[PDB]
What we know:
The structure is a homotrimer.
Chain A: E1 4-9, E2 12-17, H1 27-40, E3 48-53, E4 58-60, H2 68-76, H3 86-94, E5 99-104, E6 107-109, H4 111-118, E7 121-125, E8 130-132, H5 135-138, H6 146-154, H7 156-165, E9 168-170, H8 171-177, E10 182-184, H9 186-201, H10 205-219, H11 223-236, H12 240-251, H13 259-262, H14 264-268
Parallel strand pairs in A: 2-3, 3-5, 4-6, 5-7, 6-8, 7-10
Antiparallel strand pairs in A: 1-2, 8-9
Amino acid sequence: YETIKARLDGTVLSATFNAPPMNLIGPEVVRDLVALLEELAHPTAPRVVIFDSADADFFFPHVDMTKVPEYTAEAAKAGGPGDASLGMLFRKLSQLPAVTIAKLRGRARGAGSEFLLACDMRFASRENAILGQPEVGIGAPPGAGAIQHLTRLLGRGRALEAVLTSSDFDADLAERYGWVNRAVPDAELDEFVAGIAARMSGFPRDALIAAKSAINAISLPAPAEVRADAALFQQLVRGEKVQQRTAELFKQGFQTRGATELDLGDALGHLKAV
Amino acid sequence: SLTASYETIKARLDGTVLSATFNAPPMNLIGPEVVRDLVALLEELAHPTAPRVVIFDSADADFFFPHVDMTKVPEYTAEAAKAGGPGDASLGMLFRKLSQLPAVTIAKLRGRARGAGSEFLLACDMRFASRENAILGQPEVGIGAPPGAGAIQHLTRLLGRGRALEAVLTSSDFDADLAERYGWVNRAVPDAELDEFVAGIAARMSGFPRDALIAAKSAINAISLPAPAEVRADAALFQQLVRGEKVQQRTAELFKQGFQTRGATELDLGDALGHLKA
Amino acid sequence: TASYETIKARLDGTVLSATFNAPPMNLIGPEVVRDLVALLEELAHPTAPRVVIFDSADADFFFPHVDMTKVPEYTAEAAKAGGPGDASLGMLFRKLSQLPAVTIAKLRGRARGAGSEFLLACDMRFASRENAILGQPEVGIGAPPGAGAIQHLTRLLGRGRALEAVLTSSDFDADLAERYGWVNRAVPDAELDEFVAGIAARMSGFPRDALIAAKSAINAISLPAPAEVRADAALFQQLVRGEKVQQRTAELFKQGFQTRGATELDLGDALGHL
Lengths: 274, 278, 274
Ligand code: NA
């Protein structure tokens, strides 16, 4: 794919997001993810997919704020009527027959964090993984699953903290809060994740699918709630207050590889109230 | 900076951040005055131009709230009723209104918060506790009733079944570090850093769009709060057991040893309960 | 107090210490299930002990898993505890969870499969840092866990960590089990007996109706519905009928399953070699 480099080692696929300049989630990333999910639904597809990033500093910084309609239209192609949202695409990711493992170095914010949250397991580099939900600070509630996943993983208090402060969390704090399964030393992370994927590679396909389906049924929101979250994000992200705050962010180097994106959580605290 | 302040709650507004300090001597028992003032504060905070964020703390040297005043239950329940509709005459329903406020609420804990005191903190949006001096507990079962103002609903969700059964059924006191490990508080913070930490959190949210804060909070609450019927059921059961013979006898024994005074029984109530003889 | 063939019981005031002792290796077989059914009946009485501490007499195991050579027999025993469609360890363990008596599982050594599910059905779990091991080997063999691990682990661990524990079928030490939420706390082995005795003692003088009321209210929020317990069992049964489970179970027996060898001592690892 244009934005996803795939290497298949047995029944384990390594899918690497490589969408220069900085791995924004735009229409091409979404299009290629839609195509990948279609492939991974095949009976003889890999049992396990490991997701990682080719970018030095980011997994995904967030969605491309200049292409919201465009990436939304790509996301719609994965679903049926009512599913024109990144949120419903990430729901399909969560329900995939393949076991998905997110391996995080560097920064994953906004829908970047939501992508990780939709995967089955998250393992993060202690030294360099950073998670955040900048959406509220910019001016919209998270629209692709953070509300649904974080509330269940973190519990009410910690989810309110993460979502409403829009602050950045290092890997150790993310582990303590439950946002990732575990923080692992950077030097051990690749081997640790490869080993886990190798565990499951030899297990009966139907057992993996049955157990995952059963756990998902208990722990995923209903589609109505996913669609409601997306609709409210889609409304507020087009609103005047978000326009003004995003305009200030653009002046300060938003969607460039600089201080604003590297330390976006901090940057939001300096924005003038609208 | 116009904002109401009350006999038992010292409230002041600095921009869009309200600081509200509970100060109800002699020892911050949740009595009718505290409940009345909290009812009034929650009504004020429903206004669209009200503060984005409220920081709650305590003026008391040793307690946030020790628990409810067990000598004034009908009187404080009557005050609590004024916050809601028919069937909402309970601290549980008052604390549900607190949870659902448009304002983001931060509980800053030093010293002891037990019973309905812990339940107040649990109803707030975020809890940050002094590592050195914060203590949490649910003494209700040890006295002889299940918690009646939300601890069952909140702790089961935050702690999970096993740890909630441990906390509620043992009525033991938890220090800040263990409270954090169990999920009763968001984080334990060194005492010397706690004020600045909480101020920073509040300052973050102070400049964020009001509608985004409210939208996100409301959606999170929808997933994680009980239904009103469950809150009312929790309250009903507590109000009846606090009048059964065992609670009356054990409460009387506790009063004999200094319950509702600033002494060993209240400073270490978790321990006191374990030594009461059946 | 009553002692049983496989459950050695001592009553001290209002605290019952019930020790599982079913040689050669504490498999959950028909005798264990029979005796557990009888014990649950006794513990329903108004003047039963307020608290029960469960432990094991076996040097290496709490319960390794069920005796897979006696499935009809132990199932028939479990059936006696419930109504139509309750002939499952899942429903038996639900009855355990709903007991008026407070149950504390004190874990040394290995508890896997339905052994872990027994512990999960108890009210509190405290584990020896040095020697407690937990695992759900079911997916590795080829079915989702059928006796409550799906329902309990998803709630206690959250989606990500539950998917990890269930899909990997890996063994978890006490410290990791505590971090993930599978046990309440990990305690040094030398302190574990005193710690658990202290917890039981806290509750010994508490009003019976308060303990029962609070436990019932917590269970109502945190237990699955009976239909979901029945469905967990049925899903396990569908997959267990399949060729892969039959084949992999046979290979495990060929490698010393249900004997005190490497396969049972280190079952998590053993599944990876199939
Ligand atoms: Na948790």
